[PDB]
Amino acid sequence: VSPPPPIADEPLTVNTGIYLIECYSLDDKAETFKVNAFLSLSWKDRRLAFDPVRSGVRVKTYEPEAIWIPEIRFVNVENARDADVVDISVSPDGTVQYLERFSARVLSPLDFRRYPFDSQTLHIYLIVRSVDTRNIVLAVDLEKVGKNDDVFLTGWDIESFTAVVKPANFALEDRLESKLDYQLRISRQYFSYIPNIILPMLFILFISWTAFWSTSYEANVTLVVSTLIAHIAFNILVETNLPCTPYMTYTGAIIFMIYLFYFVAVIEVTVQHYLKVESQPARAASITRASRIAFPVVFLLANIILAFLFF
Amino acid sequence: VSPPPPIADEPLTVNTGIYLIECYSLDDKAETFKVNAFLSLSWKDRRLAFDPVRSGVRVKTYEPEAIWIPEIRFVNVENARDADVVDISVSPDGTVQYLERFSARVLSPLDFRRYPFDSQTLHIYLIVRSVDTRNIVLAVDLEKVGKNDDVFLTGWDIESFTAVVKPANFALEDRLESKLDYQLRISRQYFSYIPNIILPMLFILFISWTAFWSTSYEANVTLVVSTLIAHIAFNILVETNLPCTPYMTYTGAIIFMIYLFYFVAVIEVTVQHYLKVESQPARAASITRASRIAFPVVFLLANIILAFLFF
Amino acid sequence: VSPPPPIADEPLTVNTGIYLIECYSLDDKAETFKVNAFLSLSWKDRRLAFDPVRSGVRVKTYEPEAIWIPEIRFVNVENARDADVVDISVSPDGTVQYLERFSARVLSPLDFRRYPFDSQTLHIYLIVRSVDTRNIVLAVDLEKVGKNDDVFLTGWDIESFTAVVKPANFALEDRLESKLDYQLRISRQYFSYIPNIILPMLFILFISWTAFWSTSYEANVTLVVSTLIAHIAFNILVETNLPCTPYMTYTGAIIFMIYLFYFVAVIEVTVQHYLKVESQPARAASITRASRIAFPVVFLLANIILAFLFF
Amino acid sequence: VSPPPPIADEPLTVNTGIYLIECYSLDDKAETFKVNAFLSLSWKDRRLAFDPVRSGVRVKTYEPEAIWIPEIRFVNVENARDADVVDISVSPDGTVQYLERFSARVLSPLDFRRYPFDSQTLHIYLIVRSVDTRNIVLAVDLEKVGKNDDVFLTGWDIESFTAVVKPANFALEDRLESKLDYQLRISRQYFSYIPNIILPMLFILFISWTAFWSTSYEANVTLVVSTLIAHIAFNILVETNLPCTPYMTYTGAIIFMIYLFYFVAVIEVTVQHYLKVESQPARAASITRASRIAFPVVFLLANIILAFLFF
Amino acid sequence: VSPPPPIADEPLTVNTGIYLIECYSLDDKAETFKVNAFLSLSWKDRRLAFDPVRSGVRVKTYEPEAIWIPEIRFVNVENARDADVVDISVSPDGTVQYLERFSARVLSPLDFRRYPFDSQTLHIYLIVRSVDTRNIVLAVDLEKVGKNDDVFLTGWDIESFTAVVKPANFALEDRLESKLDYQLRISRQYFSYIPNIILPMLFILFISWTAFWSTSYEANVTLVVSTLIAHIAFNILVETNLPCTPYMTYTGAIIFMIYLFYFVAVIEVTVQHYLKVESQPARAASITRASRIAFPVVFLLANIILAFLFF
Ligand SMILES: [Cl-]
Ligand SMILES: [Cl-]
Ligand SMILES: [Cl-]
Ligand SMILES: [Cl-]
Ligand SMILES: [Cl-]
Ligand SMILES: [Cl-]
Ligand SMILES: [Cl-]
Ligand code: NA
Ligand code: NA
Ligand code: NA
Ligand code: NA
Ligand code: NA
Ligand code: NA
């Protein structure tokens, strides 16, 4: 067929409802995620209307090819969704109740400023282009919106799955387009990051600082340079599970700032030795004793300065 | 057609049966696995009933398009299963015997607390949404449940493949949903982990402790710092074949605890040298001799404390 | 059917228009990118013409199988596009207004000479092969060309999406081919590259130069050789997120030039020690004091020489 | 249609024949491989029998949908095969000659005990489930079994492609199943392994042993610990192109045994120094001179012991 | 329909022609490459013949389902090609002019003996199996063979795309098979390999040789062992972008030979120190002075010997 004709001159309202069955594969570098969910559609098509008393059955099942169904599409998806139609029910007044189960790969940008303490807002944009004959608007049936209790996103906590009830209606290539915003709110599980990356990164740094309670250049150079190399291993490791951000990330700042604490430790160590060869173990030991406090203090100051700038 | 009508207000029981042909690709990070199996369905549709004497044939074959077949779906799957229909047999009383061979990628969370000594319980959730006209319930035909003797999951031992006989029946978008739980129990093969990761990780640690039977700071710093670097190589290697767990894993704890045994060894070595420059080889050698026992003992204490906390 | 016949002997003009919905996965090594966009086509087929007064409807919808549609194809694609037809509208004069939403993986070479400060010009080549009966030419409807305000290419800034209005018409396997050039202009977001790769690469180099304010060969060899090893880690890391270019890249040149500053630092350090064993701490300290300026100066000269040669 | 009925009470024999066109992607970790081959089937269906004089053609071509074709399936495959039908020829007596060209990813476990000198036996299990009306058995037409001479598996030698002529017939879910075993025998090409992994692994070990012709702890610790680190690089590299085996592999044993030769070298070096600080360069040099022979000898003994245990 | 019948007793000649639109993804390890090209077929089918005067049109278009089309297949492909039919033109005499645009993943072995100075000959084998009724032979229409001017294979130079005009005709499972050989000749772009791998690999080796102008064992051991470790990083890096070859590669030989120049440098350094402890700085300095020439000379001799053996 073709669209149901207006029963006045009114835009056709299509009622939507996404129900998350599964959430999986949140790819941080690609800024994508996969979803498996129910998509529930509902519209009024009077042409399909009937009498429950006459036909003796209060609901009518239909195969999708048989009736007019709106061309609903996802906006922020890599390829068109994979969908199997579950049910089509028509109530006496001509109300269609569409239900399909779909799966799709979704493009939603992530903000890494507060990584790995960051929280995200994933989006699923539902859309419909209107026909010449008829204008189409989307609406949210809040009863058919949700997620099941099990959905689990490896590595994240799931706060809420809600929808912006008012659609964004606009012209696109001389036709009306109705766009809905479904929002999945998530928070990163950062427990593992503390013993697996953060504390080791600090231990290797604190080991570099033992060159302040040592008079031997040879051993000091080894202490600082070897631990600096270990810090590079961690800088490379963490920047690889991350995309090319045009903004300073929080961990990125910490790591970068640490590169200076190794550089300045090399300066101190280079100085302490230079004075011993010039025969002033006098000020060499003053500098070495100063560094012992200066470094832990400046480090702790800087980390507070940064945490304040980012949280 | 449409569902078989009730003799009376009784829900339709659909008999299920999963038979594993192949198990493969248990992805630890993604918390998924692939399965290739038979799915056997069986229901009563009186409309299909016949006389063996009249039609002269005791069993009737049907093409799937011809008859009513329940919309059975897997819950915890990435995308809908890939299935080829094997056989449809109808017995005189109107009993349908459906058989399809399918393959699917299945989402089942794994518990890494006891990794790599962990055992898992994989799930395959079978489901059916009920129609307006008729309610549908799932049931387990225990004769059509199993796995063949060859199924092999690279890297794991397979205990049992059984099913929770009582379905979980619940409302979902104002309709009854019948859900079955098929359970594949597995245990990790950890033989390789001992010589390929655990013993090397300990050898590099024991090598770090030779700095207690040495008076030379330069060589001691080298011993401890070099082996610490080797330990980082193993920490990175094992945390990469693992996902971002919001709980302390057992190996994660061991590894993290080892990072301290390197840090404290650096403290001892830094101290032993500091006293020699202050001219008290007196207590320096007391500390060095104490460490020789303190470290192996505290290490062995801690490992018992941990194994007890996790097993 | 078959192509619309000419009124005289003029080739058939097909009006094109690409509208980018999404841009994603710019793979630098493969020199590809994925696109999700609208493709709008428009041609004159008099056979379809009608009377608005007689048929009582001013616009006619058609299913794609029903009418003649030109075989439009993308040139620089891995596989043929994935497309779902959105709308076909026929105006009284026989003007067809085709609209499909497609997604494709596109091959477009990138120039890495100025990497990571490089800017690119991606291409989408639209094409049509002509029939024996009729000649077909492509044209640009500039109103149906664009991108939405959200398109975001992880890791890049998007300047413009425009089209070369004049098609390239040529013979290919004894038939006319009409080719259009759609151009997506982009610029790389290089912020992260400075603290995550460039500054660390320089800090490790400046640390190598502390061997000029040191008289100890053992510590000097350690300083230079250890930092050289750290530089290899960065050379390998950056050449891996890059393809095998038959031209000198800018970062490639910097990195390569740095390999010499380590090699020549080893020469200096090897010399300084050799003279002290020959008992001329006389010129050894002249050379060491010269290097202190020579290296930072020559390095800064060279970097200017290079930046000038590339920008 | 449905199966051809029996003349008298004999099961239907289906003649099989796999002809390998290509072998590729033997994935060692996944224990899989891809195959591209011809599958030739042949059975008697009298219902199709015809007269060459009447129908005027001595052989009849048929489209697969038109006639009864047995549901032949591969057992040990990830997903169902990708197949394009080449030819269906029916001879006057009702003999069908089926030919399809397929491609599939096949699950076949590999034995890594003798890796990288190991040889494998890959399997392709052909199967057929029997109908209610008729029993089906598979058979091997040895003339339609083979591989072309050009067929190569990157990184491997192909001995033979043969089939176990006698099928394994058994009950599965109350029906007869006929299973055939096609065997591809292969041997690993290990040439590259000697200069790219084995000899370097030994050179780094022999370098560690130069600490026996040296009196300097500082240099000795460096020699042994640095080469131990290089050995870890090789242990990690080779265990990554390998799956998690619940059995000791041969290379796994060699590598593990080497970890001890580094550990015991550290003991010796730690001892030699300890005696020099205790002033017995007397026995220190006895031990050091003993090690010089003890290590190469014990190493060579152990390697023979191992090679004997595995070959 | 079925094949066109002969005019005598001559096999049917099918004229072929591959036209490369795109070449991409030359995977060195897998020994594959992707291709996007036109496939042009042409045969004589008299049944289709017509009169230009009577039907008034000199060419006839046909949909593929309507006429007999030969079953043309690629031999050395992973899976069957993805093809969209472009055009079918029938000239009055009954000459069919088939044209499809396809894309496929192609298996073609590469020879790594001269890597990274190697040149390759990729193959595309076109094939056709003959029917009982008729014999089919392939032929090359050299006008419909080529590549466009843009084809670019990231990382390679493309010499020529030509075809072996004489097909290889042979029996396969009691039927004639006609096989054509299309050859894509390529040469590796090795510019990047010199500054990104070769020169660094040599610089680290030349740095190891500075231990000949040094009397200090501790610093010498560091120089040689540290650079040896850096050489392992490069050996692992280059053998990973390479498959498991059962033949000595040229770079493989160079790398392996270098492993000896590090081993023998360790011998020299171990000797020079041993004589100093035995008090013969007499011959120690003779050996050290000899090595200074012996190493650069033997190295340069060996490289010439190798280049001669491989080029
Ligand atoms: Cl969609
Ligand atoms: Cl499913
Ligand atoms: Cl409920
Ligand atoms: Cl209900
Ligand atoms: Cl296309
Ligand atoms: Cl199959
Ligand atoms: Cl093909
Ligand atoms: Na419809
Ligand atoms: Na049905
Ligand atoms: Na059409
Ligand atoms: Na059939
Ligand atoms: Na055809
Ligand atoms: Na050192």
The CATH code of the domain that includes D273 is 1.20.58.390
Question: What b/e sequence results for E190-214 when a residue is b if at least 16 CB atoms lie within 10 Å of its CB, and e otherwise?
Answer: bebbebbbbebbebbbebbbbbbbb
Is D26:D105 a contact under the CB 8 Å cutoff?
A: no
Q: How far is Cα C230 from Cα C228, in angstroms, rounded to an integer? A: 5
Intra-chain end-to-end CA distance of chain D, in Å: 56
Q: How far is Cα A232 from Cα D254, in angstroms, rounded to an integer? A: 32
Q: How far is Cα D286 from Cα D282, in angstroms, rounded to an integer? A: 7
Q: How far is Cα C157 from Cα E303, in angstroms, rounded to an integer? A: 48
Where does residue C63 rank: exposed (0-12), middle (13-18), buried (19+ CB within 10 A)?
exposed
Ligand 8 centre distance from Cα of residue A64 (Å): 5
Q: How far is Cα C196 from Cα A252, in angstroms, rounded to an integer? A: 7
Q: Does residue A94 sit in the same domain as residue A13?
A: yes
Interface check for E4 against chain D (CB to CB < 8 A): the answer is no
Q: Does residue B184 sit in the same domain as residue B291?
A: no
The SS3 call for residue E120 is: strand
- Amino acid in position D277: V
Residues bordering ligand 5, an ion, CB closer than 5 Å: C 73-74, 80-81
Helices (H), chain A: 52-55, 193, 199-208, 217-240, 250-277, 281-310
Residue C76's contacts (CB-CB under 8 Å, 6 or more residues apart) are C106, C107, C108, C123, C124, C125, E22
DSSP character for C109?
A: -
Look at residues D144, D177, D192 and tell me which one is the last residue of a structural domain.
D192
Q: Which of B2, B76, B263 faces A203 most closely, judged by CB atoms?
A: B263
Contacts D172 to B, Cβ<8 Å: 19
Ligand 10 centre distance from Cα of residue A177 (Å): 26
Q: Does residue B101 sit in the same domain as residue B238?
A: no
Q: Does residue B182 sit in the same domain as residue B205?
A: no
Is D217:D269 a contact under the CB 8 Å cutoff?
A: yes
Is C113:C246 a contact under the CB 8 Å cutoff?
A: no
CB contact under 8 A, E132 and D89: yes
- Amino acid in position B118: D
Is C89:C107 a contact under the CB 8 Å cutoff?
A: no
Q: Does residue B92 sit in the same domain as residue B117?
A: yes
Q: Which of residues 67-106 of B touch D (CB under 8 A)?
A: 82, 84, 86-87, 89, 99, 101, 103
CB contact under 8 A, B86 and D76: no
Experimental method: X-ray
Among candidate residues E172, E66, E186, E59, the one with its CA nearest the CA of residue E121: E186
Q: Does residue A151 sit in the same domain as residue A224?
A: no
Q: Does residue C140 sit in the same domain as residue C106?
A: yes
Q: Interface partners of B (3+ CB pairs, < 8 Å)?
A: A, D
- Amino acid in position E55: S
CB atoms within 10 A of CB B81: 17
Best mutation target among C26, C143, C156, C192 (most A Cβ atoms within 10 Å) is C192
CB contact under 8 A, A132 and C223: no
Best mutation target among D106, D216, D225, D261 (most B Cβ atoms within 10 Å) is D225
Q: How far is Cα E212 from Cα D63, in angstroms, rounded to an integer? A: 80
CB contact under 8 A, D155 and E252: no
Look at residues A192, A214, A248 and tell me which one is the last residue of a structural domain.
A192
Among candidate residues B169, B293, B268, B279, the one with its CA nearest the CA of residue B217: B268
Among candidate residues A194, A153, A106, the one with its CA nearest the CA of residue B30: A153
CB contact under 8 A, C259 and E200: yes
Tokens of E164: 């072996």
Ligand 12 centre distance from Cα of residue E7 (Å): 21
Tokens of D13: 């024999």
Q: Which long-range contacts does E7-10 make (Cβ < 8 Å, 24+ apart)?
A: E7/E46
Contacts A78 to C, Cβ<8 Å: 22, 24, 34, 36, 103
CA distance E67 to chain D (A): 15
Intra-chain end-to-end CA distance of chain C, in Å: 56
Is B61:D2 a contact under the CB 8 Å cutoff?
A: yes
CB contact under 8 A, C22 and A225: no
Q: Does residue E199 sit in the same domain as residue E277?
A: yes
CA distance E133 to chain C (A): 32
Q: Which of residues 170-189 of B touch A (CB under 8 A)?
A: 172-174
Query: Is the bond preceding residue B116 a cis peptide, omega within 30 degrees?
Result: yes
Residue A65's contacts (CB-CB under 8 Å, 6 or more residues apart) are none
Ligand 6 centre distance from Cα of residue C282 (Å): 83
Ligand 5 centre distance from Cα of residue C79 (Å): 7
Q: How far is Cα E179 from Cα E185, in angstroms, rounded to an integer? A: 19
For residue D87, give the chain E residue with the closest CA: E131
CA distances from E300 to B57, E296, E304, E307, E309 (A): 88, 6, 6, 11, 14
- Amino acid in position A125: Y
Q: How far is Cα B125 from Cα B72, in angstroms, rounded to an integer? A: 11
Q: Interface partners of E (3+ CB pairs, < 8 Å)?
A: C, D
- Domain limits for position C170: 1-192
Intra-chain end-to-end CA distance of chain E, in Å: 56
Q: Does residue E249 sit in the same domain as residue E277?
A: yes
Q: Which of D78, D129, D236 faces B87 most closely, judged by CB atoms?
A: D129
Q: Does residue C123 sit in the same domain as residue C153?
A: yes
CA distance E293 to chain D (A): 23
If you search the block for the tokens 């493309």, which residue do you land on? Answer: E158
Among candidate residues E68, C214, C87, A232, the one with its CA nearest the CA of residue D61: E68
Interface check for B252 against chain A (CB to CB < 8 A): the answer is yes
For residue B224, give the chain D residue with the closest CA: D225
* Residues listed for chain A: 311
E strands, chain D, are 12-16, 18-27, 32-44, 60-61, 72-74, 82-91, 95-107, 119-129, 136-140, 146-147, 156-171, 176-188
What kind and span of H or E run contains C186? strand C175-188
Residue D286's contacts (CB-CB under 8 Å, 6 or more residues apart) are none
Tokens of A48: 């399909």
Q: Does residue A134 sit in the same domain as residue A33?
A: yes
Q: How far is Cα A55 from Cα A37, in angstroms, rounded to an integer? A: 34
Residue C168 maps to which CATH number? 2.70.170.10
Look at residues E154, E170, E192 and tell me which one is the last residue of a structural domain.
E192
Ligand 1 centre distance from Cα of residue A79 (Å): 7
Helices (H), C96-215: 193, 199-208
Sign of the Cα pseudo-torsion (C212, C217, C219, C224, in order): positive
Among candidate residues C22, C224, C210, C29, the one with its CA nearest the CA of residue C107: C29
Number of domains in chain E: 2
**Residues pairing with D131 in the sheet:** none
CA distance C223 to chain E (A): 11
Q: Does residue E172 sit in the same domain as residue E232?
A: no
* Ligand with the closest atom to the CA of E35: 7
Intra-chain end-to-end CA distance of chain A, in Å: 56
Q: Which of E78, E232, E246 faces D191 most closely, judged by CB atoms?
A: E246
Best mutation target among D76, D77, D107 (most B Cβ atoms within 10 Å) is D107
